[PDB]
Structures are given as structure tokens and as C-alpha cells.
Amino acid sequence: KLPPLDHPLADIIYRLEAGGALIPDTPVNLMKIIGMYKAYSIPMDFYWRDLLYLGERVFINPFPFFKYFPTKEYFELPNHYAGDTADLRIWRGPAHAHPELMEFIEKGETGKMPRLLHHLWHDRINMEFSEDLARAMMWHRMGGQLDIYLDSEEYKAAADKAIRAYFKRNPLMLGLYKLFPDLFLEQARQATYMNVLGLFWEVMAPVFFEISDRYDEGSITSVKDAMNFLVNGIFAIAGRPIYHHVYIDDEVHVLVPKEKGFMWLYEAAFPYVEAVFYRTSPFRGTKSYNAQANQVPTDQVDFHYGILFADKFPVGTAGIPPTLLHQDMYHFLPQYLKDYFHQHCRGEDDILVQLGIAFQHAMYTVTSAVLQATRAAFYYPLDDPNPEHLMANRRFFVAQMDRFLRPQYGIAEACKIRNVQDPNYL
Amino acid sequence: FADTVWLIPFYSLAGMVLSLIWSPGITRKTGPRPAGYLNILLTFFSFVHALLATVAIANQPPQYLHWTWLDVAGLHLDIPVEISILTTTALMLITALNLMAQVFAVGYMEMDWGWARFFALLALFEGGMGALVLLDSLFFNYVVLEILTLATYLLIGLWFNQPLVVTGARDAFLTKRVGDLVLLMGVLAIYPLAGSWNYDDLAAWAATAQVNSTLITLICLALIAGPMGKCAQFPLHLWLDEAMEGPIPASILRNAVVVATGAWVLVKLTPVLSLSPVALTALLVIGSVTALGGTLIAIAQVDIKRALSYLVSAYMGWVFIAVGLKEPGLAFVFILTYSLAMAVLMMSIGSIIWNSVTQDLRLLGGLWSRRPISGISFLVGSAGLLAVPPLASFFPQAELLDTAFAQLPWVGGVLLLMNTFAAFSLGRTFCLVWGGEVKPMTARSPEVFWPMILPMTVDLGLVLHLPILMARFDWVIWTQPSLATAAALTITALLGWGVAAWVYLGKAIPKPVQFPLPSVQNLLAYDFYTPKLYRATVVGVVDMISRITAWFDRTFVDGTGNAFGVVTLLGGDRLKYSTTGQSQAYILTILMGIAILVIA
Amino acid sequence: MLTLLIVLPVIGALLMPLLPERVLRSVALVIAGLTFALSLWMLTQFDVHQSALQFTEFVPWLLPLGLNYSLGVDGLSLPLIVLGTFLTLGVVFTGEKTGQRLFYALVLLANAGITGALAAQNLLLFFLFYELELVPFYLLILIWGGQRREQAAVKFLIYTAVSGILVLAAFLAMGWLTHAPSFDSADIQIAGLAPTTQGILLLLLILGFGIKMPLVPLHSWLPDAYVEASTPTAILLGGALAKLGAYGLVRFALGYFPEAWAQFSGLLAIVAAVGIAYGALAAIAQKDIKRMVAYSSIGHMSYVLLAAAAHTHLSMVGAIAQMISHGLILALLFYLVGVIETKVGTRELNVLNGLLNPLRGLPTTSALLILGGMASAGIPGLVGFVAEFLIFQGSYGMFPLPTLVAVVGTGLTAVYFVIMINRTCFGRLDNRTAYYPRVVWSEKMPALVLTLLIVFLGVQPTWLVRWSETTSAQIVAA
Numbered sequence A: 001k002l003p004p005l006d007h008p009l010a011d012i013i014y015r016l017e018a019g020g021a022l023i024p025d026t027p028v029n030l031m032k033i034i035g036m037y038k039a040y041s042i043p044m045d046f047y048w049r050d051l052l053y054l055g056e057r058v059f060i061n062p063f064p065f066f067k068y069f070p071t072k073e074y075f076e077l078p079n080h081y082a083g084d085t086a087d088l089r090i091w092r093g094p095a096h097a098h099p100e101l102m103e104f105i106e107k108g109e110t111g112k113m114p115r116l117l118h119h120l121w122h123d124r125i126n127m128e129f130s131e132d133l134a135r136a137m138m139w140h141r142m143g144g145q146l147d148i149y150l151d152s153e154e155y156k157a158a159a160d161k162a163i164r165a166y167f168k169r170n171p172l173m174l175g176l177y178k179l180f181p182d183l184f185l186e187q188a189r190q191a192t193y194m195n196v197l198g199l200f201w202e203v204m205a206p207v208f209f210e211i212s213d214r215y216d217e218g219s220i221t222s223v224k225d226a227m228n229f230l231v232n233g234i235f236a237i238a239g240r241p242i243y244h245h246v247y248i249d250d251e252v253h254v255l256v257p258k259e260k261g262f263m264w265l266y267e268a269a270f271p272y273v274e275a276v277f278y279r280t281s282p283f284r285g286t287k288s289y290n291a292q293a294n295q296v297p298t299d300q301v302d303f304h305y306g307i308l309f310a311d312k313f314p315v316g317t318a319g320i321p322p323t324l325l326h327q328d329m330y331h332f333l334p335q336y337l338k339d340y341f342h343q344h345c346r347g348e349d350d351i352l353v354q355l356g357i358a359f360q361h362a363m364y365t366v367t368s369a370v371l372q373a374t375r376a377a378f379y380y381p382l383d384d385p386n387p388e389h390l391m392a393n394r395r396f397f398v399a400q401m402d403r404f405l406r407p408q409y410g411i412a413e414a415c416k417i418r419n420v421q422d423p424n425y426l
Numbered sequence B: 001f002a003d004t005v006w007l008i009p010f011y012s013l014a015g016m017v018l019s020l021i022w023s024p025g026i027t028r029k030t031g032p033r034p035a036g037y038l039n040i041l042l043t044f045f046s047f048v049h050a051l052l053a054t055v056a057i058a059n060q061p062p063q064y065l066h067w068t069w070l071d072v073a074g075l076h077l078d079i080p081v082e083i084s085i086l087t088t089t090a091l092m093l094i095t096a097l098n099l100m101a102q103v104f105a106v107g108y109m110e111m112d113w114g115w116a117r118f119f120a121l122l123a124l125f126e127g128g129m130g131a132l133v134l135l136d137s138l139f140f141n142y143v144v145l146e147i148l149t150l151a152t153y154l155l156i157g158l159w160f161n162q163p164l165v166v167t168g169a170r171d172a173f174l175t176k177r178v179g180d181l182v183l184l185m186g187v188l189a190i191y192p193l194a195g196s197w198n199y200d201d202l203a204a205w206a207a208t209a210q211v212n213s214t215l216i217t218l219i220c221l222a223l224i225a226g227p228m229g230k231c232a233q234f235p236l237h238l239w240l241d242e243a244m245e246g247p248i249p250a251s252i253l254r255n256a257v258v259v260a261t262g263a264w265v266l267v268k269l270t271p272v273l274s275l276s277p278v279a280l281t282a283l284l285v286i287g288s289v290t291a292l293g294g295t296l297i298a299i300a301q302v303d304i305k306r307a308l309s310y311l312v313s314a315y316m317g318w319v320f321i322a323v324g325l326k327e328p329g330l331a332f333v334f335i336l337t338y339s340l341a342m343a344v345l346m347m348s349i350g351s352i353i354w355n356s357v358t359q360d361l362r363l364l365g366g367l368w369s370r371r372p373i374s375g376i377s378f379l380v381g382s383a384g385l386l387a388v389p390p391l392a393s394f395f396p397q398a399e400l401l402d403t404a405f406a407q408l409p410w411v412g413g414v415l416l417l418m419n420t421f422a423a424f425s426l427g428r429t430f431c432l433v434w435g436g437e438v439k440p441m442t443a444r445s446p447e448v449f450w451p452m453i454l455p456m457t458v459d460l461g462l463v464l465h466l467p468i469l470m471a472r473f474d475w476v477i478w479t480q481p482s483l484a485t486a487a488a489l490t491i492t493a494l495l496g497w498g499v500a501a502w503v504y505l506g507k508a509i510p511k512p513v514q515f516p517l518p519s520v521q522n523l524l525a526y527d528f529y530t531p532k533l534y535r536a537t538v539v540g541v542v543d544m545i546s547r548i549t550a551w552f553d554r555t556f557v558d559g560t561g562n563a564f565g566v567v568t569l570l571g572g573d574r575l576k577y578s579t580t581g582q583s584q585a586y587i588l589t590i591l592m593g594i595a596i597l598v599i600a
Numbered sequence C: 001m002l003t004l005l006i007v008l009p010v011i012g013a014l015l016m017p018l019l020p021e022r023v024l025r026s027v028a029l030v031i032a033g034l035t036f037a038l039s040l041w042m043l044t045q046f047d048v049h050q051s052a053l054q055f056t057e058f059v060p061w062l063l064p065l066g067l068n069y070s071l072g073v074d075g076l077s078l079p080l081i082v083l084g085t086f087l088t089l090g091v092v093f094t095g096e097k098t099g100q101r102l103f104y105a106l107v108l109l110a111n112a113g114i115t116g117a118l119a120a121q122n123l124l125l126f127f128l129f130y131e132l133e134l135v136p137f138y139l140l141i142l143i144w145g146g147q148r149r150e151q152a153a154v155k156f157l158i159y160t161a162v163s164g165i166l167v168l169a170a171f172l173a174m175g176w177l178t179h180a181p182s183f184d185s186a187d188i189q190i191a192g193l194a195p196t197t198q199g200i201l202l203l204l205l206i207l208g209f210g211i212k213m214p215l216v217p218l219h220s221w222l223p224d225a226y227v228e229a230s231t232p233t234a235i236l237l238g239g240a241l242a243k244l245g246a247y248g249l250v251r252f253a254l255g256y257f258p259e260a261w262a263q264f265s266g267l268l269a270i271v272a273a274v275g276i277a278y279g280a281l282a283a284i285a286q287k288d289i290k291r292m293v294a295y296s297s298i299g300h301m302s303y304v305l306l307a308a309a310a311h312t313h314l315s316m317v318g319a320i321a322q323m324i325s326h327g328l329i330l331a332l333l334f335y336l337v338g339v340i341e342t343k344v345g346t347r348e349l350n351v352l353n354g355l356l357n358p359l360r361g362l363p364t365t366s367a368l369l370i371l372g373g374m375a376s377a378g379i380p381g382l383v384g385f386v387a388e389f390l391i392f393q394g395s396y397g398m399f400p401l402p403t404l405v406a407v408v409g410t411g412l413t414a415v416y417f418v419i420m421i422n423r424t425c426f427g428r429l430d431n432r433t434a435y436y437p438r439v440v441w442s443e444k445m446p447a448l449v450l451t452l453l454i455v456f457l458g459v460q461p462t463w464l465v466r467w468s469e470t471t472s473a474q475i476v477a478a
Ligand SMILES: CCCCCCCCCCCCCCCC(=O)OC[C@H](CO[C@@H]1O[C@H](CS(=O)(=O)O)[C@@H](O)[C@H](O)[C@H]1O)OC(=O)CCCCCCCCCCCCCCC
Pocket: A346, A349, A350, B016, B020, B023, B024, B025, B026, B117, B120, B121, B124, B154, C358, C359, C360, C361, C362, C363, C364, C365, C366, C367, C368, C370, C371, C438, C439, C444
């Protein structure tokens, strides 16, 4: 409806204006996407439980030695909407846990052993990747509008009460909190960000559950329909609350209240997409933090190290965080993707590398769903006859694609797009 | 025990082969953690063994023993191990430090898949360190000294996908290899003179020796230049500035390798180096120059990890000075205290880095209120390095004032001065990372989890007990108190640290401070442009002539071998025309055959 | 016994024609393994402290030519034979997957020639087996190889043919100037004549063996014939022929002219030092890997000349150990570089990168490459350090300046091997050019066996030396 403008990335904008598909829409491109969602949703289903366990039960533990062993009832914790007593009821299936995740907790990759022995012999769910994300949303300040609330006079008082109620047994810690009151007060903030991230993955795990079932039935036929299901699920849950609710012995301390008006879109979805998909503090085995070699940026706005910019061939090597997720997202693979990988480069040997490239593909459509939801929320739909209402959408898409071209620190020589559009990138 | 202490370097050498079971191409399932766990187990068991062996040799004489590596015609390669007190004590020091750094790595190296490659190389240092402190043969004190060079190459180059590591690991291997190679020339020319290399036959030899002055001058200069490069001393010091790629071997390399790899070889060579009073003055010169340079350069740094490695160079130059005054006891004592303090310092800096991603001193700010431990640990590691006679590093740097004042006074004038600049560096490293206004990069700094601040606090206790651990057992270091000099080091250090605190916690000066002379600020900041020096003097030469030689080989030699062939081709291609195809010409040649042989 | 070592490969070569393919490969493996095992058994029964010949065989063959079939094995000769047979077994195991009937034939003929030339106490018989080695290696360079086979191959041929000439020119001469019949060595062949002629004969033997060893200015066939040769060809050629040349030089030019060698030592030490420095500085500049490794071979062979320039009992044990070490290390490096060139499809130093990361990028041949490159340079725990240090400790009592220059050459060797390892193993993978094929299990077996033997002989080095201890004494102390 509009003329072609100038961009080197213009071939993508014409696809965003007309429907969607930040990446091409071939069937082989969507099989891997839905399989990667199914593979990424089960470790996510453990992540959102363990992060809540950290934010409520391990509030500020000096020695949280275990810290990855949620209580028996946090696997029975009702996912707020998957079952009968749901809240918005997506993913029809049971709302307590996943049989596949419970099986992996039970038997692991070796056999039916006690959970502690499943931890020492690694055989685990690599929970350290979910904590790294939670610590990456903080330190970027990207929590949303509660970070400004997470400062003083309502939080410092509630955090003080909670801390004084938590350490009441040992006077060593109590005395320490008296000397340095801001030592455990910044560890309280960390538990709050853990709770926020764990509340974000209580929405995406059912979404990624249900999208695989929709693909199984046959309701999903093209990437456009997948991202549209994602956008609909995004708008459906954009109003759910965010809170902390630290639980101590026979007591609950309202740390950030539900009555403050923090919602899921502006405090856990948008500040997350920019933190983990875009910023994701730089890799340790790819860039030099050397302060003289001006390689890592000085402002946090130019951190181009997220999944959208990541380099997935060195996966499984030293100094690269995302490997922790790809080993975590490897044994929960559907069969039609294991068969798709086994007939390819290096077979079932380098399966982590291609498994990560497919994850990059999937996260591209997730962020495209975020882009479409963003424009449908703050701008005009595609079926708009007015020309200025269509130029607004074009300006928004050009701005959001300019984030992929800014040549500050090779930010344009990263950015795996125009590389994901290639069918020979896998 | 104490009769099987020589098995300590094998425990870790058993962890350096087992940890590779978990490298990402062997397990491919459930990998990355029990390798580090079992390496920690091995290190703990080798530390218990060493502690017991030290207790058992409290009041006993050194019980040497030895095996035979090979006995070819002329030489008899003897591998002797000494079980003296300072050997098992150094074994405790090495194994406890490796335990601290490995418990640290358990916390730091999460979100990292290479633990096979990391902990196997960390086990090959703990084994190499033990084999270096046990074995007291100048020959086998070089074997492991080179194996550790190779290990440093693979350890710095841990994450090789970073283009500044494959350049730092290159320099760290070449610079440290050249020194270890002139040390080979030195150990090679000490056999015809002493008939052995056992650190005891050498001692007896140096006792009664009357050989040429310049000969021992040269061989001791080589024996110097070995540890000179191994200990990151001028001019072989750029490798340490670039060996700050890969945190916490840096907590162990700058702290347990650099301290007892070349300094250990340099101290046990005191009898030999005493033979020439020119190697000693050169030793003083190198030590003092590198001390002054390291302190002045550390003051002018912006990277917190490189504002402590130059201090490592300086405090190893201090050991060079001490061993230059024929004082090996002071060096053996100071290594312990300095190593403890620098371990605390590096662990605190690593803890700050892990959660405050930047390393720029210009981007880190107010952390004291929200991060106490990591700050007090840095402060105690600071006080246990220069001054505060309470803390233990004072004692060994007190005798080196008395000794440098008794003889050769100007050297003391450095040791005193080295105590204020090195105090102004740490000062500005504390007042920049823990004091001042808080900045974007560190706006939300949570304190680190249990495995990164346990070793740090457990190693912060050792430093506080060191002074009192030298009271229960009368290990007097500086005999004559003479408080006139004990009140000099403290004044110098406190003055340096105080001016540092005033310049940065004073808000009475622009914070990106500029020097009245701008040209020297960006000269200390780029370590006197040492790379531009290397690429000019050695590399530029070794490269140039290289590009000549190959070209020569490709042009003059090869061509000279081909010309013959080519000529023999031409001589055949332009002599077939002698068969002209005309029978009358053939009869002419037959007739020219005759009447010529008839003439001859 | 030695007759078996010489005939079994010859029988296999004559049997490669008229044989069905499946049987072709199986029987080649069988013959090579049998010869190898027989070599090990001979090595065990080699009971030492003998100071004389062992396993001798004497048959009169060609009376009007001397040329008695007179074998015999010593401490200098037997380790070289075991090395040749091991390398032959490996080369047959990783043979070419093309025209693989004229390959096993020629490889077995080459091994026969090498084993014969080593264990031959007859001058003209040695030359027979030498010029027998001449041609099949030409055929190996020519059929299998690279773009520039022909030129390369031709070069080798001629620089070897000329070699033969000189050797022959110095046998016939020194076989007649002593009016001796029966050219067989350790015999009526007794020099005992005037100088100014011993000099000419010694120079002829130097130029005839230093051109194959190879020495400093006579080396200009080595870079061209190592690089344009397939990996089994390169392994076999390097090990076999280099050791044949070095053995020839040591044995003949030291057992026949000990009065002229003591006078030419002063020049040969400087020539060897220049050779080490030259090989290192010429390798530093090369931007192809096989060229770096070839100049490595040159530099490591110059150590043998520096060792022989000093008549020390130690500096000859060191020379034999350096020959064995260079054989093993060059075999390992050529095998690894051949694997790399096959899987990656390129051999330059500016497109290779990141071959060390686990999944997508070849990491156990890169680890072995770093372990072989550090063994080549002087790094303890491996064989190269033991050999080089024996040479150094033996050569310092004599001329001390060439030994120091040799140490500098070792440093430069470390330099260029670090260059190669940095631009080959470290760095990052290009993410358009990756997708290397997998490396199958019985294709990195030879490298993984060579590596085990290298790491063993460097920490327990007695098993490198206990064979040539009394023989070196018999060589120099006479
Ligand atoms: C410097 C010290 C050197 C000592 C190291 C000893 C060499 C490794 C021993 C290997 C044992 C035999 C099995 C190897 C083959 C295998 O199992 O799978 C092959 C796969 C490799 O990926 C695979 O690579 C294969 C290609 S290739 O084999 O790597 O060539 C292919 O199968 C597929 O890519 C991929 O899965 O697994 C590996 O072998 C990689 C791990 C083994 C290499 C470890 C090297 C890392 C440490 C280097 C430095 C050591 C430092 C510590 C102190 C020295």
C-alpha cells in the first residue's frame, strides 16, 4: 500500500507490514520452531518453579547450599492457568507439573537415584542459567516500573521487616544486618528480581506447551499463525499481577504488594525482551572486558549480546553461557526434531550447535510476536486504509530494525538476522 | 607420614587425567561439575597430607632421598627430593591456595561449560608447583619450569574464541619461553664447572670456587634471566599485562605461580649468584627498576585486573632486591605473606567483577555500603602488604630496610619509596571501586553467593592470624627492632594511602584526573609502550630476517638448484639441431671426424 | 633373520599383482604387521653390552664386484629398522583409497629397501638398497599428491640420484685406493692412507648424505617434496629416507675417516648451527602448514650433524635418540596435518581458525597437534627434549658457541610452532565455512598411538637409550 523506501533490511519490513514472519515461513522452518518451543518449555516449567522457590523460601540465605531442591509441594504448585481451577486456562493439560519434567527429576539421564546424587553427578536441569537471567534483568535496571518503586520508603521498610523476621534465630546474621543494613537489603532486591523472572515464566511455559499441542492437532499451519497465537497469548495475560510474598516460618511478608499495580506486560515482558533477548551482559569467552581495548561498551544501552545477536557455533565450549540451556534443552527433544538433526551435519554429535541455531530461529519469532503485539498496542493495525496510520507503523518498524544495524561496536556484524533468513544456516 | 610426601604432585596429576573424562566431546550428557568436584577432593587430600607431613617434621633434620632418571654414558641424571621443613611448608601453601582458588572457581565458573579444560590445567599447576618445590636439582627445577610454561600457554588460552587471548597467550608463552631457554644455557654451562646440579653440590662448589670472573658473570646472568622472565620482570613483563585474560588462574597465577616459580629458582641459586658481585648489582638494578615501574604504572591504570598485576611485578622485584642482598630467608618469608595478601586481593576483585560486569575503574562506584565483606577483605589484603606492623608483611620488609641501610643505602631509598607508590595504587583502587558516587554499571550490585566469598573470608582469616602465628612459635624475622626504621615504612604507606583517599574521596578535584604533564599520564598508562617496543626491537628484527631467509630459500638456493636442470634442458633443446636432416651434412661431420683425429 | 625383514615386504610387493582386492588390503596389513612384530622380537633378543655385530649373515654373491650379501645389525642400526617397520605398518594402515594395488606394492618395496640399507655390512650392497629406495618414492610422490606433484617429484628424484652418484663415487674410490676386494664393511676396507685424499672422500660422503639427510644448502628438495606428497607418502619418505641419509653419514663418514672428521668438526659444527637457525627462520615466514613442518624436519636433522661434529660418547647416544625422536614427531605432525587438510579442505594459515572448540570444530586432532608441536620444540616430558638435551650436554665440552646457537634455534622452533598452533587451533570458527566431516574412530588411531609412544619415551627415556649405549661407545671411542 506504500512505496519501497531505501533499507538494506527493507525485504524484512515488507514482511512485517504484510502479516509477520521476521524469519521466512517454510514448513521445515516451523517444524523446528515448534519442536524448540516444546523442548524449551519443560526446563522453563522447572525454572519458573525454582525461581519462585528462590524468591519466597530462600529469600536471603547466606548458605543456600541446596537452593535447587524445591520442596515437594512446589512441583504440585498449581500453574495459575493450565487446568480446571485456572485463571485464563491455556494449555488444557494438567496444571500441577509436567510428566516429562517429573520423569527427568526422577530418573535423570542415568537412573532412579536420590535427587542430591542427581545433583552431584551433574545430571541436572542447569538452573544456573535462569539465575543468570534474573541477575541480568537487574544491573540493567530493566525491571519495568517497579525498579523505581524498588528503591525506598515502601520497599526498604518491608524488606527491613522481612529480614528482621528471617534471621531472628541466629544473632550473628542479625548483628551483621545492624552493622551493614544495605548488605542484605541488596540481596532482598535480588530475590525480588528472581521472583519477577519466575513470574514471567509462569506465563510462557503454558504458552509454549499449548502451541506444540496446536501444532500437533493441525491448527498451526504457518509461522504467521504461530506468532499470532503468541500475540494473542501476550495480550491475554498482559494484566496479571506481579508481587513477591516472601514466606517465613508461619508468616507471609508482603514485600511488593499486589495493590501497587504492577502488571505482567510492563514489568516482566517488555523489560525481559530487552534484557535477555537484546542485552544479556557480554560473553566471557568472546569479548575482552579489558578496559583499554574499547570492545565492551560503556553504556548499558549498547549491550548487543542477547540471543538475537548470539554466535551459536561455539556452543559447548568454555566461556559461553547459553550452552547451559542447550544441554538443558537437549533431552526434552521431540522425536521429529531428533530425526531431523540426525540426518544432517555431524549427526548426533554436534546436536547442541544446530539445536541452538533452531532455538535462535524460535526466539526470532518470539521477538517478532513481541513486535507485532507492541505495534497492535501502541499503533495501528495492518488493515488500516488511512496512509498516515500506515506510515506510523512503517516508522515503528524502521526504528525497531535500526536497532539491528547500529554500527557502534560491530552491533551490525553480530545480529544473526539476514543470517537466519538463509536456509543454509543450521 | 612425611615419608610419602613426594606423592603429593601425583594426586593432582591424577586429577589432571580424570577431569578430562568430562570434556564436552566425551560425556555429551550430564557434564561440567564432578570434574571440578573431584579435583577439589584431590586438592583437599593433598593438603591434609602436606599438613601432616609438616607436623611430623617439626623438629627433625632434612631427610633427602633420590631416584635415577637415566644414566647414559657421561651424565647421571639424578632426581633428588628434599623433605625439609620449608618444602612441606611450601606444599601446604600451594595446596591450600589451590583449594581456595578452586572453591572460588566453583562459584565463578558457573555459566561456563569448560571445566574439563579449566580444572585439568589447574591440577597440572598444583602438581607442577609441588614437583618444583620438592625437587632440588637445577636440571629438574627447569623441566617442570618449562612444563608450566606450556601449561600457562594452554591455561591463558582457555576461551580461545576471544581474539585478545590468542594474542596474550602467544606473548605469555614466547616471553616466558625465552627466559626459560637462556636458563637452559646457564644450567648447561654449570655442569663443566660444578660437575653436578643438586643445589647442594652447587653450594659446596660456590663455597670453594676460584674460576674466571667473566665466565661466572655470564652464567649467573643467564641464571638470572630465566626467573627474570618467569617472574614477570623488566623487560619481560608485557606477558603478565596480557595474561589477565581468564580470571582465577589470575587469582592463583599472580599469587601462587609468579611467586614461587622464578623466585623459588632465583632464591635457591643464592650460593651461585653470590660468586660474582656483578650479577648481584645487576639483580638490584633489575629489581629496583621493575619495582618503581610497576608501582608507577599500576597507579595509572583503569582496568582493575591490570591495576594489580603491575603490583605483582613490583612485589616480585622486591624479592629480586632481597635476593640481591644475599638474603634468601627474607625472600622465603615474604613470599608467604605477599601470596596470602594478593590472594585476598585478587579474590575480592574477582568477586566485584563477577556481578559488576565492567572492569573499568571509571565505571565502578559506591559499593562500600552494599558490599562490606568484599571491601574489608580488600582493605585487609592491602594492609597485609605494605605496612601496619600488626599485619605480617611488615616484618620481612623491615629487615630489608635494615640490611639495605647497613650496606648499599640507595637501594633502601627505593624500598622506602616503593612503599608509598604501591600504597597510592591500592588506595586509588579502593577509593574508586568502593568509595564515591555510584555509577549506571554498578547501580544494582548484589553481593555474590557463598562459594566466592567463603575462600575470600577463609583466606582473610589466615592473613589476620599470620602475625600471631609468628608469636606462638618464636619465628623472629627482624631481630633488632630499632623503631626509628619501623616508624618509616608505616609513615610512607599511610601517607600514600591517605593522599590516595584524599584525591578520590575529596571531591576537590576533577574526577577523571589529569596530570600537569599530560604526556606522562598516557605513558604510564600504556606501560611505557612496551608492545611498540617489542614489535620494534626483537619481533621487527626476527620477523624481518625471517622474511629474508624464506625469500632467499625461494629464490637463491632453489633457483641455483634448478638452473642446472634448466641448462641441461636447453643444452638438449638447442643441440638436437645438430641432426640437420641432410645426409650430406652427416657425411661432412664424418669427414670432420677424420683429418682432426688424424691431427690429434 | 634379517633376510626375513628384507624378503617379506619384497614378497608382498611381488604378490600385490595377481591378487583380489579384499585380499589385497588384508594381506598388505598382514605382511606389514608381521615384519613389524619380527622387528620387535629382534629388538628384544638384541641383548646389549655386545659391542659387536649381531644377527649377521654372510653369503658370497657377485665376486667380480665385491657385493657379498653380508647383513648384520648393531645398536645404531636396529632402532632405525624398528622405526622404519613401525612407520610402514602405519602407512599401510592409512593407505590411499585410490589405485591401492600399486600402493601397497611400492610401500612394501620401499620398506624392504630401507630395512636392507640399514642392516647391510657391504658398501656396494648398501648402495644397491639406496638406489632401490630412489625410484618407488618418486612413484609415490607422483601418483598421489597435490597440484604440483610432477615438478616436486622430479626434484626429489634428481637430488636423490645425484646423491647416489656422490656416495658411489666415494665408495668405488675408497674401495680401490686401499686395494681391497670384497667391498663389505667392518673388513679389509681399511683407510690408513695419506691426507688431502681422505678430505676429498669425506667431502664426497658429506655431500652425498647431507643432500638426503638433509643439511643446510642441500635441502632444496625437501619443502617441495613434503608439501606435494600425500600424508602416508610424506610420513614414510621423511622418516625412512631422512634416517637412511643420517645413518649413512654417521656410520660411514665416522667409521672410515676419523682423522679427517676431527679436522672438519670445526666447520661442521658451524654448518649445523647455521642449519638450525636457517630452518627455524625459514619456517617462521611460511604461511602453509606442511611447509612449516618440512622446515621443522630440516632443523631437527641439523641436530644430528651438530651431535656428530663432536665425538663425545654422549653426543652420539644423543644423535641416535634425536633421529628416533624426529622420526616419531614428524610422523605425528604429518599425520595430524593430513587429517586437518582432509577434513577442512585447506592448509593456509589465514583461513584455518578455531579448530579446538568440542562440537563443531575438530578438537582431538588439534590437541594432539599442540602436543606434537611442543614435542618438536624443546619441552620436557616429551621425546624431543630428551634427545636435544643429550645432544647439548654432549656438544658443550667441545665447541660451545654452536651449541648456544642450537639452543637459539630451538627457541625459534617454539616460536613458529606457536604461530601455527595459534592460527590453527585457537580463534573462532568461520560460520559459513564450517561443517567439517566427522573423524572416524579408526582414523585417529595412528596419531593416538604415536602420541602415547611420544609421551612415554619422554618421561621414561631409558627405553630410548638402552639400545645404542655400547654401540656409540664403539663408534667414537675407537
Ligand atoms: C594438550 C594435551 C593433549 C592431551 C589430550 C589427549 C587427547 C584427547 C584424548 C582423547 C581420548 C580418545 C577419545 C577422543 C575422541 C572422542 O572420544 O570424541 C571426540 C570428541 C571431540 O569431538 C568430536 O570431534 C571429532 C573430531 S575430532 O576427533 O576431534 O578430531 C568428531 O567425532 C566429532 O567432531 C566431535 O564429536 O571428543 C573429544 O575427543 C574431545 C575431547 C578429547 C580432546 C580433549 C582436548 C581438550 C584438552 C586439551 C588440552 C589438555 C589440557 C590438560 C592437560 C594436558
